[PDB]
Paper text:
In an attempt to achieve a maximum in accuracy and reliability of the structure, micro crystals grown under microgravity conditions onboard Chinese space mission Shenzhou-815 were used to prepare seed stock solutions to grow crystals suitable for X-ray diffraction. The structure of native SaThiM was solved and refined to 2.1 Å resolution with R and Rfree values of 20.34% and 23.04% respectively. The homologue structure of Bacillus subtilis ThiK (PDB code: 1C3Q19), sharing 38% sequence identity, was used as a search model for molecular replacement phasing. Therefore these residues were not modeled. Analysing the interface regions of protomers A, B and C revealed that 10 intermolecular H-bonds support the complex formation. No Mg2+ ion was found in the native structure.
The quaternary structure of SaThiM is a triangular homo-trimer with dimensions of approximately 72 Å on a side and 47 Å thick with three independent active sites, each located within interface regions between two monomers. The following β-sheet strand 7 is antiparallel to strand 6 and following β-sheet strand 8, which is antiparallelly flanked by β-sheet strand 9.
Numbering used by the authors:
A (entry chain A): 1 to 262
B (entry chain B): 1 to 126, 140 to 267
C (entry chain C): 1 to 134, 139 to 262
Amino acid sequence: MNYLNNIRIENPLTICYTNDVVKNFTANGLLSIGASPAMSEAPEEAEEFYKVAQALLINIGTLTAQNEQDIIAIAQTANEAGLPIVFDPVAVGASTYRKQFCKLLLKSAKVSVIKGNASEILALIDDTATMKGTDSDANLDAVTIAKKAYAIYKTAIVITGKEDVIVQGDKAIVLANGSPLLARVTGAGCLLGGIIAGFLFRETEPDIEALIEAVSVFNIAAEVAAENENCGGPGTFSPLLLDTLYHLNETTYQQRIRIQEV
Amino acid sequence: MNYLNNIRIENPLTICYTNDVVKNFTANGLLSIGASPAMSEAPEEAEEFYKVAQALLINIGTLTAQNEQDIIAIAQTANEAGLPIVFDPVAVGASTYRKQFCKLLLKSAKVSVIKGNASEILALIDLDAVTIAKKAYAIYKTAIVITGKEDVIVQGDKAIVLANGSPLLARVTGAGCLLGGIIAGFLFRETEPDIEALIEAVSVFNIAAEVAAENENCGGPGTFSPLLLDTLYHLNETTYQQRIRIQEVEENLY
Amino acid sequence: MNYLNNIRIENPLTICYTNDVVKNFTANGLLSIGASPAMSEAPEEAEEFYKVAQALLINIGTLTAQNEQDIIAIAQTANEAGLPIVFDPVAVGASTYRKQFCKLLLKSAKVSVIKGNASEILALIDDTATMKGTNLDAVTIAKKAYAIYKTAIVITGKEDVIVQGDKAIVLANGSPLLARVTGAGCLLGGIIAGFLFRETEPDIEALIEAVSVFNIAAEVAAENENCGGPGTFSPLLLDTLYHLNETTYQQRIRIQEV
């Protein structure tokens, strides 16, 4: 756990422009691993915040007309500042509104990681694709979709699912950690977007190892939290997830990581 | 527990336009009973979302000028789509601002359930929850749920009084704003819902609250909230049937 | 615990205009001590809400162009209604945008408590450009701020500082786990509001009791045998606030004058 040690020591300022359902959970997840979250949404303070920040998360869960301009503006401010952007195109497949916005954003700014479930990333690369908010199952290959998305955007792609897929540069990786209770907790993937941002340390082209570690730290903590004897369900799980992220050590991480290339 | 089994299996898409204090808790309550919550607030996507959704919740807890037009617009889009609306007129009696807005909304769109406490519903129409709920039903021709010590439901020609739940619910900020969401989860795209679905929504919620508050690890309103979510997640037919408490009136008028 | 008993009995309507990360936790914190929170943000209902309310919290954690005017308007409405205001200038030192806004607000309205950490309050007074002839500890900063604003100052930190009228106090309760929970200080702003009972110039004893209740509850929660970290801490903090009694309070309070 190279990068996590550095997060706990350096306390990286991690800006989050995220959706209204998950702000509190995202901030508590970041605080638990030692990062310094800031949910700054005013374009007027983006320049000064971004100079000293290590990453920015943009998550469009609750996109409205009031957000659209601000989001484009702060993405551009981030590019000018060399601040890496993690982008979560939540439920992009569910509306033509979200598809058009995501297209505009990816034409207006370079992002450093694109993270979503299989249907979300599919809808990005194929605008006839369709979803609810959740992901169509049996999607074709998360691996094939991630590789196609990488070729199009030349940006690291993370596809979450039963198993998680990461594509960066010439490598593709499949990870197989976590718990089913994660899917019954509303912040989870939106929180993962924030955690990934916490691992970037101002690298606009992040090392795949940093992404692998972000996802594995999150999923291993979930795994362990769900095994706790006081985990009685999705309610009690969530405080335990945060405890487990706080205490996670090298030994547990190395014992539990499940990873495979190509 | 006819309806709850179906929610767990079908995973109904349940749109929530609700207040900024309760969004997270409402989404988690829904997820715990197997629904699929989506807090979509842009009128620009309402048409597409609503076509495939099973209900919409409108809760005005944190109503501001920025919400007013959007809410009226999406309620109209829900009506055009045949998507049932649950309406929570939060604190409508506390300001003329809310009274005027609720009036405009109910003049602009047909809703499928109106839910509040007694003084909220009273303030809508202008202690005795049953009478108030009947009066409100006559005016709006829409199912009324009034929450209180005992809960009242009026739909079509029936009125019912329910007596489940816990005092700790009143010391948790999401509770009733969550109940609005849960009820939306039980609608399955019926614009005129069966009273049995509303009875089940309310009883599931209150029975889970009862059982959560009896848990040995419940030490107060803090620990009660996670346990409430656990208990909604696990709630079974046996516990439901053992604990439900009802009282009742048939054949009312027009 | 004079004031806390009265909160549990009287159930004071406490209006919170606070940031989007902490609304729910602030409402639950207020509910747990017996207060009645209302997160009303429309200027259009402020006059009616404020007539019957006991305090207003204003916390600028997620300040945007859409908040600025509304916040100035409601502060003015609060002044006209005699409703006391607790003001949390979150991260004011981090941008010119926040510095200018906090200035505008404090030129536009009289607040009843100003709460922040040392570097927030220091940035407030450094930007007033009044401190001719001015390392600095919290006590000195709080006194400098009091002289400028003539308004109770609470500075949170390792030890907490309160300055009201001619007294300064240093408190030493709490837990490090508080710093690892995102609502905490923003919640303390709301708890302090809950203790004001419509006093625009609150007695320092009320402010002492607000802060000590909060920090003593945090202390006890963190000792609980089911507290395994910042996650489980938060629900136990709410439980502890709900059950906190006179005996625990008197046993644990740690307080020193100037």
